[PDB]
């Protein structure tokens, strides 16, 4: 269905029913009615559709992009190299947006799953969210609507220069 | 159109436009030098033709 490592879940722990009353549980009998009247006919329809799909099985693939030289390796104003480097940077930018979305979805699912214990039990998801947001912010934030690989590089070199100076003074 | 056709069509467009931009910049530089120095085919304002001069002996000797 989906990669359990990319979208992890803990092992579910349900407690067995432990009635302390003589009254019948209306939920238990509604569950039987739902299984018989709703789930069973629904499952039959799907199984029929699944048979048709097996008769006609065909594939689609995930496009793989070869790495090309990046903007740091492009001569100034050499548009042919800048174009390939720029299109690559844009593709990675769209991928990093989705990486942050994956981490945000982990954080949101953990908070709902852990209930009232979420502040303690979701620490690791929160910490990972904090790190990827920091990395994403360093790469791309404040570039403006006309962002480009060139502006991304100019921002990185500014950060690197401040980091070198800070260590120099240290 | 597939993404490879558009991608490589873009490169062909970029090559033509980039080459034209370079030629446009050279022409401005070439024109500037030719006009300032007059050593090229452009801005070649005429001077009198020397084949109009008479070289035969004249009526008097000093010329």
Interchain proximity A80–B18, CB inside 8 Å: yes
Contact (Cβ atoms closer than 8 angstroms) between residue B42 and residue B34: yes
Give contacts of A 87-126 with B, CB under 8 A.
Answer: 87
Outline where A114-122 has alpha helix (H). 118-121
CA quadruple A140, A145, A147, A152: dihedral, nearest 10: -30
Rg (CA), chain A: 26
Sign of CA pseudo-dihedral A32, A34, A40, A46: negative
Which of B2, B8, B11 should we substitute to test contact with A (largest number of A Cβ atoms within 10 Å)? B11
CB-CB neighbours of A106 under 10 Å: 20
Residues in Cβ contact with A84 at an 8 Å cutoff, skipping those fewer than 6 apart: A68, A69, B11
Q: A25 is written with which tokens?
A: 């549980």
B-chain CB neighbours of A66 within 8 Å are: none
Residues B16-19: contacts with CB within 8 Å, 24+ apart? B17/A79, B18/A79, B18/A80
State whether the Cα torsion B10-B13-B18-B21 is positive or negative: negative
Chain B closest CA to A84's CA: distance in Å? 9
Give the phi and the psi of residue B45 in degrees, each rounded to 5.
Answer: -80, 140
8 A C-beta contact, residue A89 and residue A74 = no
Judged by DSSP in three states, A144 sits in: coil
Interface list for A 19-78 with B (CB within 8 A): none
| Resolution expressed in Å | 2.3
* Integer Cα distance of A24 and A31 in angstroms: 13
Alpha-carbon distance of B2 to A162, in angstroms, equals 44
The angle, 0 to 180 degrees and rounded to 10, between the axes of the packed helices A79-113 and A149-169 is 70
Say whether residue A79 is in contact with chain B using an 8 A CB cutoff.
yes
Q: How many angstroms away from the CA of B16 is the closest CA of chain A?
A: 11
Q: C-alpha angle A148/A157/A100, rounded to 5°?
A: 55
In this structure, the dihedral spanned by the alpha carbons of residues B49, B50, B56 and B58, taken in order and rounded to 10 degrees, is: 80
User: What SS3 class is residue A131?
Assistant: helix
Residue of A65, A83, A84, A87 best to disrupt the B interface, most CBs of B under 10 A: A83
Q: Give 3-state DSSP helix, strand, coil % of chain B, rounded to 5.
A: 60, 0, 40
Q: How was this structure determined?
A: cryo-EM
């Amino acid at each position: 269905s989906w990669d359990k490592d990319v979208y992890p879940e803990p092992p579910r722990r349900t407690p067995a029913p432990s009635p302390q009353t003589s009254l019948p549980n209306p939920i238990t009998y509604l569950t039987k009615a739902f299984d018989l009247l709703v789930d069973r006919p629904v499952t039959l329809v799907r199984e029929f559709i699944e048979r048709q799909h097996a008769k006609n099985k065909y594939y689609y693939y995930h496009r793989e992009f070869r790495r090309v030289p990046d903007i740091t390796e492009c001569q100034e104003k050499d548009v042919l190299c800048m174009f390939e480097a720029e299109m690559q940077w844009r593709r990675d930018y769209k991928v990093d947006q989705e990486i942050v979305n994956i981490i945000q979805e982990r954080l949101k699912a953990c908070q709902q799953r852990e209930g009232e214990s979420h502040r303690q039990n979701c620490a690791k998801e929160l910490e990972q969210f904090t790190q990827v947001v920091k990395a994403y912010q360093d790469r791309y934030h404040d570039l403006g609507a006309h962002y480009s690989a060139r502006k991304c590089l100019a921002k990185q070199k500014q950060r690197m220069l401040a980091e070198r100076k800070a260590a120099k003074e240290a | 159109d597939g993404p490879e056709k558009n991608y490589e069509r873009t490169m062909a467009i970029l090559q033509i436009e980039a080459e034209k931009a370079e030629l446009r910049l050279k022409e401005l530089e070439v024109r500037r030098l030719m006009r300032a120095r007059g050593d090229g085919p452009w801005f070649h304002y005429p001077t009198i033709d020397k084949e109009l001069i008479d070289h035969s002996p004249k009526a008097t000797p000093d010329n």
